[PDB]
Structures are given as C-alpha cells and as structure tokens.
C-alpha cells in the first residue's frame, strides 16, 4: 500500500511511517510479527472512505491523534488508569484458581 497510494492516490498524501520498537505477538494464530506505523493527513474527504474500504482487508485499527497535541494528556491517562486496573485481575484470578 505504501507504493499503491503513490499512484492510485497520486501519492497525494505525505507518507510517513516508522518502525516499531519491540513489536509483540500477532493475534489471529497468536504469534509474533513486525509492523510499521504510517501517518496520513488529508483535506480531501471521500479519499478517507476509499482508505477504509481498501485497508479493511489486512487490518483497520482506526487511529488518529489530536493534532492539537495537548489532548495527548487525557489520551494517555484515560487508558493508563485502565491498564493499571487490569494488571490485577490476572493475578487475582490466577491465585484463586490455582489455590
């Protein structure tokens, strides 16, 4: 897709993707893999619907940060608290069950 967008979309979006530091296990067959994180802007609209109906095939984990990059704060916290919480159920359940 990196190159497909180059011509089907004219390459009209400033393509920006980065390597992942220490990726993790995939899910379907539940093993490891590597990936990259493309960042795409726009000011044309339906191009976005094109993006959706083309990228759903492989993986469409829809994401976008607040360009006004101060929402970042709550972005972090709202799920940092959630993970802090979920870190417990694992130990609690394991302990009770095994015991």
């Amino acid at each position: 897709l990196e190159q497909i967008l180059w011509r089907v979309l004219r390459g009209n979006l400033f393509f920006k993707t980065v390597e992942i530091e220490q990726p993790v296990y995939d899910v379907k067959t539940r093993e490891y893999k590597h990936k990259n994180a493309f960042i795409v802007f726009s000011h044309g609209d339906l191009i976005i619907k094109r993006i959706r109906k083309i990228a759903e095939s492989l993986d469409a984990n829809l994401y976008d940060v607040d360009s006004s990059n101060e929402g970042r704060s709550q972005q972090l916290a709202k799920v940092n608290k959630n993970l802090s919480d979920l870190y417990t159920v694992l130990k609690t359940t394991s302990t009770t069950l095994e015991s």
């Binding site: 190159q3 497909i4 011509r7 089907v8 004219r10 339906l46 191009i47 094109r50 095939s57």
Partner: protein, 392 residues
C-alpha cells in the same frame, strides 16, 4: 496500442507535461528533438485537441473516471459484438467496409483528422452532462443495433425453417409444386383418392393385391407421374369408410407416414409465404447493412472521444495545474511496438519518478495478493505514465 488485424495501423496516446523533456540528448525541449526518434523517420507524431472540463473535487475525478472506464470498456465490447454481427452479415467473405475510407474519407488521417469533430461537442456542458450524454447515447444506439440483429436472427431462423422443407430427400419436403391438382377425382362424392407413394422395388408390385377394395376402384388408370427422389408416387382409390383400414394395411409393409391431403390454397399459401420470407430477408440484409455501418461510423467518434477524456483525467491527476499539455498522439506502421516504445516510454517514466527503479512493468490485474494490479484506479506497483489500446 491497437487491437485489430487488417491492412491498417496502430495508434497510442500518452501524457506529456510541459516540465517533461524527451531525454535522449541534452539541450532541447518537448516538441523538438522528437521527430524521427521513433525508428524509421516514417511515423507522424501529433497532439490531441481537448480543453479543460470544469471540475469541483478530486473525489469527483475518481468517480467519473471509474464509471467512465466501465462504460468505455463496455462499449468496446459492444463494438466488438457489432463487427461480429457485421461479419455474420458477410457483406464480403472477408471483412468489409473496415479500413476503407472512413465516412468516405481516407482512413489514415480520419482519426488525426480530429479538429474538434463536433456533433453536440460544445463546452457549454459540464462533466456529468457529457458523461450521461454519451452513456445514454451509446445505450440507445447499441439497443437499436440489438433490435436489428434480433430481427435478423428471427428472420434467419424462420428462413432456415422454410428452407429445410425445400431441401433434403423425399418424404421430408412438402407437396406444393412437385405435383399437379387435376388428378384426384372429385367427380364422385363416394370415392376417396389418396396419392400414396411406395419405393421403386415394389412400384408395380401393388398392381396385384389392389382390387379387394370397395365399389368402383377405377381400374387401369393408376400410375406414377413423378419420382420425388428415387421412390414412386401413384393413385389409389378408397371409399370414405376405406381410409384408415387401407392406411394400416399399407403401412404393414413399411411405407413412411406421409400423406398430403390436397387443397389448391395450400400450395398457394406455401408459395406466398416462401416468397414473403425471401423478400423479407432480402430487404432486411440489404438495408440493415448500410444502417449498421452508418451507426458504426457515426459512433466511432464518441467511442474514441471518451478515451480522450479518460487520458485528460489521467493528466489532470498526474500533473494537474495546467489541465492540458502535449498529450501526444502516435502514428507509425504496425508490427513494430517491440522496438518502437521501450526506450522513450522508460525514459519518460524515469522522468516521471525519482524514488523507485525495477524491471517488471505493466498494467495487468491478477487476484493473487495485494500486489499485481497496475493502475491508478486499482492498485499498482510501477506505472508512471498513461497510454492505451487505440485502433479503429
């Protein structure tokens, strides 16, 4: 490129912007330095005449491009079906009226003859306007062609049906012109005469067991006056209650079930309908040929203007701000694409990109994986410029 096979040529269009150059030797620009570059000093390279067409969105661009491409290729298939049915008409044993002076005008120029060949081609319209215009115009003209060909299909089926009854061996034909009426005696309203036929081997052999029938079997007057193919027909008497018994008694030794109970109007109607079908098909072919060829030639212009519009779309995408450039035409003898394209097309692609270089290039689409689609409408890997199959 091209698609047909005749004593004709092949044609292509290409996107060339202003910033582009024909890079084969430094110190020149587009229009010059490309006059005989294409081998032979024989070809003739020109541009295409087409202005802007007012557009609102790029998201628009894509949708009109897709729908157009669809209808374009659909009507390409339609025109293929046309040439097929025209050959079926077989105005000539070989292909006819193709490569002949198009619209009575020599073929070579009649496409580079395009000086904005206008029928309703006026800029006043908009994009959707001419889109639906041509779509529906093609729709109706092709439907008319379909009606023409279906009329011929029905006519040919019925003509063949009739011709079978006038073709083949005896006992498969009808009786409308091979016999004459004034033999079945109706002088008496008691006797009934059946003109049954028998093979040659036993023609006179039915002159022995033939008199056990009823009153007044008029004797010494039955014989054969015609021989359908090889076997023999004759005259038989039988009373009004002496029909099915005789039929079974005769079929007991294998005579075909074929009796033509006569009435003059039968042969009259048969001759009338044979003549009617003959004249029907005659007029049908002789007029539909000219009608179809006329529709064909009048269509060609829009059939190619649509792809001209396609390449204009391709342009306004690929290089944008000036919606037109030297979108160049090519005219060169055929059977030479192998060593008449590669250098220049590869050089223009080289100019068209600055981040990718590989060996395999093309347009095909194969549903193997995300790779291998090669268009700006479907996925692609390496396809800088734009051209297409152009031929009458």
């Amino acid at each position: 490129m091209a698609t047909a096979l005749y004593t004709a040529n092949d044609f292509i269009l290409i996107s060339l912007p202003q910033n582009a150059q024909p890079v084969t030797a430094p110190g020149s620009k587009t229009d010059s330095w490309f006059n005989e570059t294409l081998i032979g000093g024989r070809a003739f390279v020109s541009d295409f005449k087409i202005p802007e067409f007012k557009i609102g969105s790029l998201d628009t661009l894509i949708v009109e491009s897709e729908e157009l491409s669809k209808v374009d290729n659909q009507i390409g298939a339609s025109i293929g079906k046309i040439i097929e049915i025209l050959q079926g008409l077989n105005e000539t044993s070989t292909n006819a009226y193709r490569t002949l002076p198009i619209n009575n005008m020599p073929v070579p120029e009649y496409l580079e003859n395009f000086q904005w060949q206008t029928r309703k081609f006026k800029l006043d319209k908009s994009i959707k306007d001419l889109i639906t215009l041509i779509s529906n115009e093609s729709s109706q003209l092709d439907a008319d062609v379909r009606a023409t060909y279906a009329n011929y299909n029905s006519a040919k089926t019925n003509l063949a049906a009739a011709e079978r009854k006038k073709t083949g061996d005896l006992s498969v034909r009808s009786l409308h012109d091979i016999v004459k009426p004034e033999d079945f005696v109706l002088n008496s309203e008691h006797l009934t005469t059946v003109l049954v036929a028998v093979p040659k081997s036993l023609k006179s052999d039915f002159e022995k067991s033939y008199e056990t029938l009823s009153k007044n079997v008029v004797p010494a007057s039955a014989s054969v006056i015609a021989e359908d193919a090889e076997y023999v027909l004759f005259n038989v008497h039988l009373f009004k209650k002496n029909v099915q018994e005789f039929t079974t008694a005769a079929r007991e030794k294998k005579f075909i079930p074929r009796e033509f109970n006569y009435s003059e109007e039968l042969i009259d109607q048969l001759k009338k309908e044979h003549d009617s079908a003959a004249s029907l098909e005659q007029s049908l072919r002789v007029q539909l040929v000219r009608l179809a060829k006329t529709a064909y030639v009048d269509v060609f212009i829009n059939w190619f203007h649509i792809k001209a519009l396609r390449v204009y779309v391709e342009s306004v995408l690929r290089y944008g701000l000036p919606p037109h450039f030297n979108i160049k035409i090519i005219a060169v003898p055929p059977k030479n694409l192998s060593k008449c394209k590669s250098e220049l097309i590869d050089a223009f692609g080289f100019l068209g990109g600055n981040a990718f270089m590989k060996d395999k290039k093309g347009k095909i689409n194969k549903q193997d994986t995300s790779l291998h689609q090669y268009a700006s409408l479907v996925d692609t890997e390496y396809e800088p410029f734009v051209m297409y199959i152009i031929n009458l």
